[PDB]
Structures are given as structure tokens and as C-alpha cells.
Symmetry: D2
Subunit: 421 residues, 4 copies
């Protein structure tokens, strides 16, 4: 039974229905390794390396998805190198191509580039879910753009705002995180071909000293992998600073989400909101997931700081554990946020009452600045105006309404629209 | 295929042969929940609560290890509460005991206490492995207690030490971490019975207001669970400050191990040591695992800081992901350290040469303080003494030898001996 | 003007009246360096090193507190080594002792040991303030041991507790932090004399090879410095793992305090408490200070992990910035907590009302378990009992009262009493 | 004496000559507060608020830099609010303007906006120093673009590279950090006018309900403060997510710098480089400073996550301590890096020898791939080619040379050139 052994709670519970569970699986990674060896073979052939035949390539393409795990496992045992084992395994499936698989390339060629492909694919799915989450929150905000409630500083009544303005305040936190992850996705650079230390000496020799062919190969493989950007300067691997940026972008989602979810939990305790005695359990799961993403950046940064010269392998086990975990955690977090925003509702009776218990004083503070219970005379020059505000709280909310609408129409939608359907 | 879905690399790779994979499994946790309900039932009966019959208890004890996962899963679906689902499931297996299962107790009774039992058991196994690791390092140190090499500050020659003194320097870092985890294990407090908010009101009513019976029950269950200490004051759960201490103790192992492994990696690069071109891959895996434990404390501390009043559930998902991960990471780290120390060896030819290229100058520095190539006269009062040191480097190492032996005999062994066999 | 240049906000604002500002000053550190050179001189003389005369020692003791900063500054310039500069400066003040100052010792002798003395002294003051803080909270708890209020899970009504039980829940968090810092203080180990790499070779030669004299000197200096424990095994410095423990203990205070202060801020927002519209500004400052201590442990752990072989100086600037900051932050935090607990009060009218709006339902839940508005019949066997609970909420709080008293009398007081007056 | 009290080691030692010490001083902050009140007054007047006279504004502009600290201090005492105290103080200096100072604005108006101005100014200076640092490293790299040395993986010989390629590898890490901080600087958004809760209700009333005037005022003040971007949506303060981005950008500098400095420290230990027995003390200070920036991001992220609703003040003390510290630490780090790169040199004799001891084997590995000591026959088809590589190591470095030049000319210079002179 699967329950008899420790299991990833993210994979088996919080993200069981996410495509990330497939994207980040060993099978998909090994598949990407083969796909990369395929593209490498195709590009080298296209560039004149005759030793790579079309028959060899056809075997590779035909057997890309065929995995003999029992065999692969024994191979990873005889020789303690996964890449070598998989190359050997792929070699036995494609005997004609066996000799040219990974020709001139380093193991890091498939390892690093497969991670980048797996990561970006995962990020693309996260971005679609992210957009939906933000869209749901925008819907909630518009729906409540004119529902008055008390603004709070130190968690205490400070003025009057609208549920919608606050909804947009939360929306902005999430939108800025979205924009960060969105920009990271556009700027992500592919490693391409760089050799074992980054000099490309093996490929150069392979091309009899022609550097333009080495550059063309690097560009060609990058193009096949569907990347617009690639590193030109590297050691054995692409800069781990790129991974820090990846983790940080997701940590922004965590910080933003935790602020939003804690607000909802507090507001629910105040009796103002109700997430889909009713406990805000979804919001609490949201804070737990968010807390994890928030505490991840410093490890990624330390990984970079710990990289020795052209490369030290103290990053492998660390990257293998860290990155897939944050990607999945972010997805589980977004799924939760989506549930919350789809059914989040306002306890209008409680909100109206909270507003009524505070509006007299906010009115008094208002009269004092402009300078019922104000028949002195002394408020004679501001009595009617204040009374009007008290009978129409919405006029006590400054520009909450227009701010809410313009932000959504001119900033939020234009930003996420391209990710929604 | 298991490879087709994301898997915990710790569970499936770095710790596949560890009993922690069984101890931290869902099956073991659910089993502990049942064991706790059993002990609760036994204690309540022993204390006079007649509603708990021996037949009910016998059903429970007989069916403790019988799991109908397909049923349990559907139950966790109809009702979104694992504990309730498992209670229901255990109830169907024991129809006579169904009505008294968890009588007066809260879900946290099994949840919190099962974690504590699972954690301590895991810690006990970690401590046995830890002791073996330290023992191996002590063996290495004794073997090299008189093998001279250069001491280094800023990674550069500063004097002469012995490989063994350095081995004991590393041993102390690990021993202090061991002592921290060892003390934490002895001081760990059980939650026992506390009710949903920590007042024990349900048990009090159950005992018709007799507080001594409530206290006796709390003590009795703690005794059955094999804990010498228990909290008296709590909210719904036992203080998450205890979990911070747990994570911190393991972070000490990480800091210590990373310092040791980085030293070995650097020494191997210098050509002085060789872990079992030879790359220090095991030491690198050690730094990656260590880095993870080092970056965990702040999350545990934040979990405590985030706990609201008697309890907020923003800690569950967080604890479920954090603690089992650090426990497993520590075990994988210790397994690696053990491999390293069992076959770590000294490249005596290289060490001897490094010592020879530096000993002339260390000798010169020595003569200068006491005040061949010193025939001036000027060194006439210290020439023979220095020459003697250069022909016998070991006499240039101060008290390295006695320090190494006394530390091992009087501090290291007495501390770990009780955990070795 | 001092305002014209960046200033430490801790030193100039949050701790301006604390003795830590004097204890952690450069003058006190240099003074400790001189005191250490004095003790070293005395011990070496007591052990037979005739070159150290009583006249030399008298100069040193007489001029220990005389600082010519302008001169010292120019000296720290000509030669880029503070210790050497101060030795030179102290040498000019004591021309007879100039030649034997720091005889056989390394710079780290004064640096590391002065830090330990400064740190422990700072910790002792922190412990006295800590005890007072806990004492104030215990006073508050006893005063409210029978003031009923609602218990909360997910920040929502879950039962009835007493303000005092909650006060003791907070008290325990702080007490466990206190015990950690208190134990660290008792176990703190002195570096003593160890040489530049930890072998004590210089002192050995100084004593003509007699190791017992080296050990006696190490013990003697430790005794003069008033330390019961000292390291026997070290590299150039004492293990930075000790500093991690120091920072972690203070991080426990931060986690505990933040949980307590956040609870108070939330309770004040609920209208249940009032710290000395009233905003909980002191509690907010408490969370900010606490947050800083919580985010410090991982840096200290990384410092240890980064230590290369016998020593790398990448820890100096880091330690100089980190440790004094956490010590001061903890003191500022404790001062704030003290203010809060001395005037914290309960809004009894609001609490009574909150209890009344919830007690009917808690009563209903109570009747359901035991099995006005219960005249069915159906509650006929529990109507009077529940009605009694509703007319006497205190009987609805389980063992809150006895738990509060026994914890304070048997755990809290015995622990802090020795630090209060 | 200043030495008699704890001092900021950054302000008094590591950055004593930096303009950040002036920019981040209390005097400069209070000056910015006054400047902001001045701009607010000017804009409100320009927009029709007649109550603001030109005489009032002239007093303010004339007395902007006049500080009566003794008075200000007593004022900060009578009333426990710095902003109110400074307003009062500025009011006494400008009796005609006293009544309209900060008209309609919140304290956060000067607090938040002054921080943003102080921060950006500090960042601008950091960017100029950063550019110089990168320029120095590029100079070093070009100078050594053809100096061959061994490439290293696991800190061990893996191939041949050029000192310059490695220099450019380091340069890229720093350049990516530079680009991050550079982009953050361009995107930084001003808070502008938003009211106490973000609704701008006070300004709206002040403009008799005309929203365009409120928007114009917000835009006008932003323009006067010299900001191209401003937030439209906020609570009381501008999003603390912006501060997380600020801290993270600087943490990138720390991660990059630590990787670079650790490499230099290791290379110096190998005898390949020498920073300006020679210990790499500057590089060690660099790692200590870098470590601090690396461990800062998570606190900034937690600050955001902890922000309650429109605002909670648990961020003030935290921000006041965190941000100025990282800004100064980054400046001290850059100053150190600059020193290092200006005099960093290669120990050409040692490098040449290290290359010679390894080039035979690298040659053997090379021959094996293409398929003296190779006279078999068996190498007959590759003997001359390999021999040529061994007599000309530079041809063994793949594309190191062209990569180094193109990166510097096409990526590094175009990026930093605008910041150098």
C-alpha cells in the first residue's frame, strides 16, 4: 500500500490533480533528456556532422517515450551516474544511434536544460492558474465596489472604505507577484551547449575549429527547445542566480497571499467575511503554504553563493529538493486561493452594524476637519454635510470606487487577460 | 509506473532503506491514532468510566492494524476531516466500541500525540545513526592522531597540526549537535489530554468534576505512550516552540556537517584527503543536505509566532511538510557522513610534501619567537632545537596529540557510547 | 550634530538607557582586552614565567582604563590590525610591560574571550529584565485567573477560558525561551588560551614542553575571567556553534514574544484588552523587534557552516554586526514587553458581553455531550446543570483556574525567582 | 567619547566616507519631511487652495534646513509622535504657515515618501559604485583574457580556461545583480498623497469633491519629488512588497559577491591569485558582508505578509532597522570589491606550473575523444594535434577568449557605461 511509506503530501494530496505532478516526474525528466539528445543530434546533423545519420535519429525519435525502468534501475546501480545510465539505456533501444548520442555534450546538457524546460512548463501552468485567481478576486472586488465597511489601521477602525477597494488592495499584491513571475518567464535563459566547463572546447574540436558552427549549434538547439534567450557565458551550468530569481518570484506570491489570507482570517473573525461556527480553514491552509514559499529564497541564494568556480555539485540534491517543492507549493496555494475567491462572501448584516457603531465618530472627526448630535451651534456650518455622510456612508469613502474600477480596468485586466482563455 | 508522477526524492532515493520511511508513513500515523484511542479507552476504564467495556477495548486492540484504505478514502471525502473519517472507519471495525472511541478527547489528541511519538521514534533512530557517525570519525581521528599536516587560517598554512586533531575539531562540532538533539529527546513533552482549547472541560464533566481524575488520566495516557514528561499548560495543541527546538537541533547537525564536509572538499582539492580524478561527491551531497537543515529553523520559529490564541490551523500543512522533511534529510545526511568517514583516507605522500614545503618557514618563525640555514651566528642558541623540530614535525604540533586522545576518551565516547550497540 | 549622520536606532533610541550600550561599546571591549592581557600576565607569572615582573603587571592594572583614542586611531591606521594597535598603545602606557604583553598568546585570545565576556554580561542583564517581564505577566495572570472570556480557535469562539489561563499560556512561551537562554548562560564555554591554530604550541615552548603548565594556564585564565567552563578543543577560535546557540535562544524569545504580542493586538482589536481609539503600538513595536530576532538564527548557523578549517575570517564583520544587534534587540523587546504587562488591562464590559453572546450556544454544545431554551423535554436530565453553567460561566472553564495557579507557583516562580531581586 | 557607547560599525567604520551616512541620517530624513510638506503646500496652492499663501511657503523654504534639535527632542517627548513633533517644530519656525503645514495629508505622507526618496538616492550612489566595481572586474578580465589556467569542477582540474573567462563568469553574476537593482530603481513607485487609509477622502473634501484635483495633486507632488511612477492603489502606506524587491535585489549582489569572493579566497589558497603569507582578508570581509545581505530577504517578505488590512505599525521599527542596514552593507561590500579588483593579480609562475602538471592528462583525454608519450602507434592520427595543444595551452581553452570579449563589449559595457562618468 502507498500509505505504508512516506509520501510527498504535495504530490499525493495538495496537487494530485495538477499537471505539475507529471511535468516534474522522473519519467518526464528522462523524456526531456532524450528529447534534448534528439535535438542535439538533429542540429549537429543540420550543421554538417555526417556521423549523425537520419536512421540513428529516427530510432531516437521513435523510442523517445519507451522506458524499461527495471533495466534503467539496474544500470543506475552498476554505474552510479543517472545520465550515463539513461544514455546507455537509450543506446540499447537505438543501437544505430548509440555511438552518437550526446556527441560532444556534457551530462549537464540534458540535466540543466531539462530542468529549465520542466520549470518553465510548470511556470506556464502556474501563470494560467494565477491569472484565474486574480480574475476571481477582481470579480469579487467589482461586485463589492460599493459595499461600505470600516477601514482599519492597527486592526482598528480608522475610516470607511469599500470591501472592493480592499479587494483591489489584495489584488495588487497578487498582481505584482504575477508580474514578477511573468517577467521571469519571459527572461528565462536556456543553457544550450557549453561543454563541461563552459568553454565548448569539445564542440569546437568536433567542428574542426569553426566557432560560428559552435555558436550556430548553441542557437539551433536553443531554438528547437523553444527558448528565445540563452546564456552565452557559463561554467558547467547556467547561473544559479536564475534559480534564485525563480524562487524569489514565487516567494512574492507567498508574501502577498499570506497578507491577503491573514486579512481574510481576521475579517472572518470580526464577522465581516465568510470563506466558502465557520472557520477560515482554506485561508489557514493558504498561510501555511505561503509561509513555506516565503522561507525558501535564502536557500536558493545560498546555493549560488556556495557554487565553487566553474561548478561544485553541492547544488544538485539541493536544487532537486527545493525547486520542485516551491513550484508545487505555489500551485497548491493558487488552487486554494481560487476556491476562496470563488465563494468568498460578505456578511452584510454584520458589516452594516460595524459601520453604524463607528460612523458617528468618523462623522465627528470629519466635522472637526471641515472646521443630530451637532446642534450646538458650532457645527451649523457643517451639520448638514456630515448628516448627509452618515445617511450615505458611501460618500465617506473618498475615491474608493473610482480607484477600484480604474485599477481593475487599466492595470489588472490588461495584465492578466492574455492568460485567461 | 511510480516514475510517471512526482516523488519525494528523500523517501524514494536518499532514505529508501530507512525505517523513517515507515515511521513517517500515513499508515503508521493512523496506527498511532488508533493506539492512542486504545490507551485513552484503557485509562478511562481504569479510572472508573464504566461505559468503556473490555469487549470494546478488545475489538480496538484486535483491529488496530487493519486498514481498509479504499473505504477510508471515500470517508475522508464525504466528510472533510481525516480524524473523523478514521474514527468512523475504526468505528465500523469495532461496532461495540464505536460509541466510546475518543470519548471526551479532541482530534488534536491523536494528531498532536501521534506526531510526537512518530517524531521521537524517528529521533531515536537518528541518534543511533548519529552515534555511529561520530564513532567512525573518532576512529579516523585516532588512526591519524600523529599524522602531521599543515594547520590553516584563511585556508593558508599557519602552523602544523595533526590530521587527528582536525578530525576531533570536526568531531566536536558534530558531538555538540548530537548533545543538543540528545537533550531535546530527553526533555520532549507529551501533550496528553487537554481538550479542544486546553481546559480539559470535557474530561472534567466526564469525571463529574473530579480534577484529580482528569490529572490522573493525563498522567496515565502519558505513561502508556511511554513519555516521562508532558505539558500541563496548553491551548489546543502542545507549544510549537517545542517543534522549533526540534528543527533547530537538526539545523545544528547541518551547520556542523556542512563545515566538516566543506573542509573535506577543500582538503581533497588540496590533495590531502580522499573520500571513499577523484571528486568528493559524497561530501557535496552532504553540503546540499546540510544546507536544507540550516534553512529550516526560521520557518519553525515563524510557525510559533503565527499561532493565534489557543490555536490557528495555519500550522498543519506547514508542520506536515516541514518536520518530516528535516527528520528524513538529517537521516540521509548521517548515512552519507557515515559512508564518508568509513573510507576517508589521507594522501600521505601529498601531505608529507606540503608539510616539507612549509616547515622551513614555520621553523624560522619558531626561532624568532624563542629569541642548516640558521648558521649565522644569531640562531646559535636555538639552531639545534629548530633543526630537531624540522626533522620531527610532530614536535611542532604543540598538544595536538594529547588533546585528540583526551577529547575522545573523556568527552566523545562517554557521550555516544550508550547509543552504540 | 549626531543627527547629521546615520545612527544605530537601537543604541540611540530603543536601548539608550540600557547598560548594554556600555557593555557592547568599543571602550569596554578594549578594556576587556587589557583585562585579559592582565590576567594572562598574572597567570603566567604565577606559573613560573619570571620574565613577567610585578612592576610590569602594576603598570597594566593601573593604566587599564586610560584610553588615548586619537593615538589609538592613528595606530590602527599605520598598522591595519586593531589588536596590534591596542597592544602597541597599551605598551606605550606600560613601557616596563611592553615586551611581555600577550606573551605567547594570539590576538584571538583577547578578541574571542572579550566577546564571550561582553556577551555573557549582556545576557545576565537580559535575564534580569526577562525575569521581571515574566513576573509582570504572572501578576497579570493571577489578577485575572477568574475573569472568564471566550477561548478561540481560528480566532473564533471555541469555548470559555479565563484571561489568566491565556496569560499563563503566553507566560509559558516566554518561560521556555527564558529557560533556553538561562541554560545557555550556564553552559557557555570560555576559549581560554589555545594559540593561533588551537595547538598551544607557543605556550608549550614557553613552558619548556611542560603540558600541565599549559593546561594550568588555560584553567587559571579561565578562572580569573570567572568562567566555570572552557573549551579544550578548538581551532583558532571557540566554536561558532556556540554563537548559533546564543542567537537561537534569543530567537525563541522573539517567536514567543511575537505570538504573545500578536495575540494582544488581535484581542485589543476585538475590544477585550487595552495595552498601556487606542492602538496597540507597544505590541506592534514588540512584533517588529521579535521579527528581527526570528530572522537571525540562519545567519549564525551559516557563519559556522562557512568556517574553513582552523579558521577563516569571514566571520568577524559578520559576528560584529549580528550578535551585538540581537542582544540589543532582545533588550529593547523585553523593555517593551515589561511596559505592556505592567499596564495591560481587561475591558470587562466588552468581555462580559462577548461571553454572553456566545454562552448560550456553548451551553447547547455542552448539553449535547452530557447526552430556559431547553424546555423540551429532552434536556430534562441536563437542563439545570447547563443553566447553572450559564449563570456561572467560570464553571464552564474546566481546569483553567487550577492550571493557572499551579503553573505559576510550581513552574514559573521557581524558575525566575532567583533573577528577581 | 564616542567609543564609550555602542556604535553602528557600518556607519562609523565600513561606510564612514559614504554619502549614505548623510542620506540615511535623521537630519536628512527630517529635511525630506519638510521638503515634502513644502511640495505639498506648493501643489495645493497651484491647484487653487487659497488658504496656502506664498508668504507661508517662503517661510517654509527659507527655514527648511534649520534644526533646533534640543527643542525637537523635548517635543518628541511631550507628544510621542515624531512627525507631529517635527510639524510643531517646523510650525514654530514658520508661524504664518503653521496652520497649513501638511494640510489634508497623513504623517505617512512624509514618512513613506521620505524613505522612498532617501532609499532611491542611496540606490543611485550604490549603482555608481556598482558600475565602477564591474568596470574594474572587466578590466582585470580583459587583461587576463589569454592567461591560461585550469578550469575546476568540485574544485578540481576539469579542463583549461582563461583567468579572463572566469573573470567574466564572476562579472556576469555581479552584472545580473546590477541589472536587477537598476531595473528596481527605474520601476520604483512613489506613494504620493493617499490619506490615512488610502482613500484620499481628506483631500477630496479639501477640493470640494473634485476628484481630478485630488489626482492632479497626487501627480503634481510626485512630479516635484522627481518620480516618474507612483502607486494609485494603497492602504495607508505604499506596498511593502516594493521593499522586499529592494532587499532582494541587494541580496542578489550578496549571493553573487559571496560566490566571487569565495572563489578568490580558494584560488588564493591554491596560490593562483593574490588580492591587494598573504591572506585574502578583503575577500573574507566581502563574504561576511555578502552573507548579511543574503539573510535579509525573508525578513522583508515577512514584513509584507504581516501587514494587517490597510496598515499595522509592526513594520516601522522593522523597516527602520532593516533597509538602511542593507543599503549600507551593500555600499561597504561594493567598496571592498572595488579595492579587490583594482589590485587583484595572478601568480603567473604558480598558474603556469599548475597547468603543466595537468596538461598531459587533459591532452590524453583530448586524444581519446578525437578517436611524446603517444608514440604507440594508436595516436598516430592525433599525436601532432595534441602535442600542438600541449605546447600552446591557449588552444586548449575552446572559446574562452571570444566569449570573454564579446560578453564585455556587447553586454557588460552597454549595461554599465551610463553609470561610469
Amino acid at each position: 500500500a502507498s500509505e505504508d511509506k512516506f509520501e510527498s503530501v504535495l504530490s499525493t494530496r495538495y496537487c494530485k490533480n495538477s499537471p505539475l505532478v507529471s511535468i516534474l516526474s522522473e519519467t518526464n525528466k528522462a523524456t526531456l533528456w532524450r528529447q534534448l539528445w534528439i535535438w542535439l543530434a538533429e542540429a549537429e546533423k543540420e550543421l554538417g556532422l555526417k556521423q549523425v545519420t537520419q536512421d540513428a535519429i529516427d530510432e531516437m525519435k521513435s523510442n523517445r517515450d519507451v522506458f524499461d525502468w527495471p533495466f534503467i534501475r539496474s544500470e543506475e546501480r552498476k554505474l552510479k551516474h543517472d545520465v550515463m545510465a539513461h544514455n546507455h539505456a537509450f543506446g540499447k533501444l537505438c543501437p544505430t544511434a548509440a555511438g552518437i548520442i550526446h556527441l560532444g555534450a556534457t551530462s549537464c546538457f540534458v540535466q540543466d536544460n531539462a530542468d529549465l524546460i520542466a520549470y518553465r512548463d510548470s511556470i506556464d501552468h502556474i501563470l494560467k492558474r494565477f491569472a484565474t485567481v486574480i480574475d476571481r478576486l477582481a470579480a469579487f472586488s467589482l461586485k463589492n465596489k460599493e459595499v461600505v465597511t470600516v477601514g482599519r489601521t492597527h486592526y482598528q477602525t480608522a475610516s470607511l472604505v469599500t470591501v472592493g477597494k480592499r479587494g483591489v488592495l489584495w489584488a495588487q499584491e497578487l498582481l505584482m507577484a504575477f508580474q514578477s513571475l511573468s517577467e521571469f518567464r519571459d527572461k528565462m535563459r536556456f543553457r544550450g551547449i557549453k561543454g563541461a566547463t563552459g568553454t565548448q572546447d569539445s564542440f569546437l574540436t568536433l567542428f574542426a575549429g569553426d566557432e560560428s558552427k559552435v555558436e550556430a549549434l548553441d542557437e539551433l538547439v536553443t531554438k528547437k527547445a523553444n527558448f528565445s534567450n540563452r546564456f552565452l557565458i557559463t561554467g558547467q551550468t547556467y547561473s544559479r542566480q536564475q534559480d534564485s530569481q525563480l524562487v524569489f518570484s514565487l516567494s512574492l506570491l507567498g508574501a502577498a497571499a499570506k497578507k491577503v489570507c491573514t486579512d481574510i482570517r481576521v475579517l472572518q473573525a470580526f464577522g465581516e467575511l465568510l470563506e466558502p461556527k465557520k472557520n477560515p480553514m482554506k485561508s489557514e491552509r493558504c498561510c501555511a503554504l505561503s509561509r513555506k514559499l516565503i522561507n525558501a529564497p535564502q536557500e536558493a541564494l545560498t546555493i549560488l553563493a556556495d557554487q565553487g568556480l566553474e561548478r561544485t555539485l553541492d547544488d544538485s540534491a539541493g536544487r532537486r529538493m527545493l525547486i520542485p517543492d516551491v513550484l508545487l507549493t505555489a500551485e497548491a496555494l493558487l488552487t486554494t486561493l481560487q476556491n476562496i475567491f470563488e465563494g468568498l462572501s460578505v456578511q452584510t448584516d454584520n458589516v452594516k452594524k460595524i459601520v453604524e457603531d463607528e460612523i458617528a465618530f468618523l462623522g465627528l472627526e470629519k466635522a472637526m476637519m471641515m472646521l443630530q448630535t451637532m446642534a450646538d451651534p458650532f457645527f451649523d456650518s457643517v451639520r448638514d454635510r456630515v448628516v448627509g455622510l452618515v445617511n450615505n456612508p458611501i460618500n465617506f469613502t473618498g475615491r474608493c470606487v473610482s480607484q477600484t474600477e480604474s485599477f481593475i480596468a487599466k492595470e489588472l485586466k490588461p495584465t492578466i487577460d492574455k492568460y485567461l482563455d
